[PDB]
């Protein structure tokens with residue numbers, strides 16, 4: 507139908523929820539999958555996909571290994587971008603914001619909700635580091651599977667999460683003749699300013 | 706089946722071609738769609754999706770408006786990342802490289818291959834700038850549609866392209882227990898060094 511300004515909610519999260527909901531409703535693969543880009547110390551951007559696990563006015567949350575590249579990069583530069591690749595629905599959602607570490611309480615809560623085998627997996631992988639063979643991973647997995655026996659499988663100290671603040675949220679929706687609809691929500695003192703951007 | 710080092714081609718492009726081919730073969734939406742991330746002058750990364758239009762040992766090519774945000778950003782920092790979001794196939798391809806402008810000859814060649822209405826659209830949109838209403842776009846479109854009458858519709862001077870060099874190419878493929886396969890191809894003097902990365 508198109509995207510007209512007069513139909514936009516004041517809070518970008520309202521619009522995001524609808525699009526997310528419809529994405530699940532359309533059974534797209536991993537509707538919560540978002541591309542998170544970070545920057546290293548030399549000005550070089552880096553990307554990898556992560557899963558959005560929670561969101562609210564404070565920002566969007568995802569979990570990762572604290573010794574990974576994305577983590578090292580965020581510690582040197584917290585500015586990150588998030589892009590939800592919903593093009594099968596002719597849609598795109600981009601977020602600009604600052605990443606901050608979640609508290610152990612939050613992390614513990616979420617970690618103990620993941621499939622056991624997944625919790626064990628968390629222990630196995632020294633994310634982003636070069637390993638000489640896949641076998642290293644599989645061996646540790648088995649070793650830990652029984653070591654724990656799963657008394658409850660502990661939260662690794664190198665596992666955490668980040669919350670990305672909402673400073674800017676862009677919505678994109680397909681248009682014919684290459685003339686798409688773009689609306690940029692810009693935080694401006696707890697309030698949002700909306701502008702249509704040329705496609 | 707999995708991804709073992711012994712099965713990797715020496716040239717990462719060989720592996721990329723197979724995965725791209727299979728992606729089209731699987732009828733994923735826009736198999737050529739890739740997320741391109743750039744960095745602004747403040748260290749802030751930015752993302753938007755663009756279409757890969759050509760690739761070879763020199764790098765990956767895509768077209769865009771030369772006055773856009775991505776273009777301004779590339780002019781200040783040419784380091785870019787490219788991520789092909791093929792997660793419906795439990796796959797991921799990430800490229801690190803430098804973006805460089807294509808020559809007018811190349812651009813002219815590709816531009817005149819796009820649907821007429823698409824060529825006209827190129828003229829209409831001052832990409833990334835704030836516009837007060839969608840009507841601005843539609844009006845110009847009609848005005849230009851007949852202005853040109855389409856004698857051939859000229860190449861706008863503000864339309865171009867970039868080629869991103871292949872300095873690093875990462876392949877990711879789903880694994881159970883969160884233990885995925887990751888291989889990072891690293892340019893090292895016209896040659897490629899391969900390392901498996903912890904997931």
Ligand SMILES: Cc1cc2nc3c(=O)[nH]c(=O)nc-3n(C[C@H](O)[C@H](O)[C@H](O)COP(=O)(O)O)c2cc1C
Nearest residue numbers: 536539554555556557569570571574575576634792
């Ligand atoms: C659909 C999908 C979901 C993923 N979710 C996560 C996630 O939530 N956290 C994570 O650390 N890695 C996740 N990954 C793997 C990452 O893309 C990446 O390989 C890993 O975090 C290491 O990135 P880094 O080396 O840039 O730090 C996911 C991959 C796919 C394809």
Ligand SMILES: Cc1cc2nc3c(=O)[nH]c(=O)nc-3n(C[C@H](O)[C@H](O)[C@H](O)COP(=O)(O)O)c2cc1C
Nearest residue numbers: 593735738753754755756768769770773774775833
């Ligand atoms: C599937 C798909 C393909 C796209 N391909 C391109 C492209 O090749 N070139 C382009 O300039 N914009 C393309 N866009 C629109 C961009 O994502 C973006 O909105 C536009 O280039 C402006 O980005 P910028 O403001 O960061 O410069 C595409 C969008 C989608 C969803």
Ligand SMILES: Cc1ncc(COP(=O)(O)O)c(C=O)c1O
Nearest residue numbers: 557569570620621624883885904
């Ligand atoms: C390395 C890694 N960590 C975390 C996740 C997702 O978190 P969870 O296992 O709690 O669904 C993924 C999903 O693919 C992943 O690959």
Ligand SMILES: Cc1ncc(COP(=O)(O)O)c(C=O)c1O
Nearest residue numbers: 571573628629630631632633664
């Ligand atoms: C699975 C895993 N990841 C990360 C680390 C430590 O991270 P780093 O060596 O980058 O300080 C460890 C240390 O034992 C680990 O076992």
Ligand SMILES: Cc1ncc(COP(=O)(O)O)c(C=O)c1O
Nearest residue numbers: 684686705756768769819820823
């Ligand atoms: C603004 C813009 N430019 C270019 C393209 C793709 O190039 P082409 O029209 O030659 O297929 C797209 C595709 O969605 C686009 O949205």
Ligand SMILES: Cc1ncc(COP(=O)(O)O)c(C=O)c1O
Nearest residue numbers: 770772827828829830831832863
């Ligand atoms: C469609 C379009 N894009 C871009 C520009 C110029 O770009 P900028 O104002 O950022 O120098 C023009 C100038 O006429 C234009 O017509």
